[PDB]
Amino acid sequence: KPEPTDEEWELIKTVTEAHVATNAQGSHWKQKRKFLPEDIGQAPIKVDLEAFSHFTKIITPAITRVVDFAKKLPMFCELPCEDQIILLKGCCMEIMSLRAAVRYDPESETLTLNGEMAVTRGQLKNGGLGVVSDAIFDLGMSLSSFNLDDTEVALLQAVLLMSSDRPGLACVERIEKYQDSFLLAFEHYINYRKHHVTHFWPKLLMKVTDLRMIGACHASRFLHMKVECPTELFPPLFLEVFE
Amino acid sequence: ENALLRYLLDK
Ligand SMILES: Cc1nc(C(=O)NCC(=O)O)c(O)c2ccc(Oc3ccccc3)cc12
C-alpha cells in the first residue's frame, strides 16, 4: 500500500500545522474546559433561550478559526476571493462539528466547544441544534475507536474545505484538483498509519459523508430556529454563512 | 453581501 510521496509529506506538514495553529486551546482543552451547568439547556416546557444564548456567543470565534485554517493553505489562498467565500460558507459548520466530535469525552458524555465549553447531548439539542446534536455526538462516539491524529483531522478538514460542488463556484476543476491532492495524501498517510480498524479508508470516506450531512442539516436547523428567534439574535458572521 | 467574511478573508 503506497505511503506518502515527498510532495505529500510536505502537504501533510502544511495542512497539519494549519490545523494545529487554529484549534482552540490546542493541547490544553481538557484542562480549560468548563461544564455548562445542567440547569441550562433543558427541554422547553422549541429552543432553550439560555443555552441558545451561550452557543451564539461562541459561534463567531469558531467560524473565525476555520477562516484562519483555510488562509494557512496556499491552495486556498490562490483561489479568487469569491470562491474563498463560498468554500468557507460551505465547510465552516462541517469543520467545527468535526472539531467538536473529536473532543467527545466518554467519561462525561460531553463535547467541548470553543476549546472551553463542555456540553451534553441534550444541551446542544435544546440550544438549537435538534437532531443535529445527536448526529454530532454519534459521530464523536464512532470516532473514538478511529484514534485520529492531528494530521488525519486536518486532512478531513481540507477535504471538506475543497468541495467543488458548492453552488456558485468558478474554479470547480481547480478545487477538485486540490481535493484530490488532499485525498491521495490522506489515503497514503492512512496506509502508512496502519490503524487496527478494518476497511479504514472506506470507513473514513463514510465519516466525510456524515459531516456533509451535518453541514446541510445546520441550514435546516437555522430555518427552524428563525421561527422563534429574530435574526438579530444570531451573530452577524453566522448570518453570513447562510445567506 | 458577505461583508464581514470578506473582511476576515482579505485581511
Ligand atoms: C457545531 C458547532 N461547533 C462549535 C465548536 O466550537 N466546535 C468545536 C471547535 O470549533 O473547536 C460551536 O462553537 C458551535 C456553536 C453553535 C452552533 O450552533 C448553533 C448556532 C446558533 C444557535 C444554536 C446553536 C454549533 C457549533
Author numbering:
A (entry chain X): 211 to 255, 263 to 460
B (entry chain D): 741 to 751
The authors write:
As ligand-regulated nuclear receptors, THRs have a structurally conserved LBD that allows the binding of distinct ligands (Burris et al., 2013).
Surprisingly, roxadustat (FG-4592), a first-in-class oral hypoxia-inducible factor prolyl hydroxylase (HIF-PH) inhibitor and recently approved drug for the treatment of anemia, was revealed as a positive THRs activator. With a molecular scaffold distinct from native thyroid hormones, roxadustat strongly promoted the interaction of both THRα and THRβ with various coactivator LXXLL motifs from the family of steroid receptor coactivators (SRC1, SRC2, and SRC3) with EC50s of about 25 and 15 nM, respectively (see Transparent Methods and Figures S2, 1A, and 1B), suggesting an agonist nature of the ligand. To determine the molecular basis of the binding selectivity of roxadustat to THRβ, we solved the crystal structures of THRβ LBD complexed with roxadustat. The existence of roxadustat was apparent from the highly revealing electron density map shown in Figure 2B, whose interaction with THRβ was stabilized by a combination of hydrogen bonds and hydrophobic interactions. Notably, structural alignment of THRβ-bound roxadustat with various THR ligands available at PDB revealed that roxadustat shares a conserved carboxyl head group for all the THR ligands (Nascimento et al., 2006, Sandler et al., 2004, Huber et al., 2003, Dow et al., 2003, Ye et al., 2003, Borngraeber et al., 2003, Hangeland et al., 2004, Bleicher et al., 2008, Koehler et al., 2006). Despite that roxadustat overall aligns well with T3, a unique structural feature of roxadustat different from T3 is its extended hydrophobic phenyl group, suggesting that a larger hydrophobic cavity is needed for the effective ligand binding.
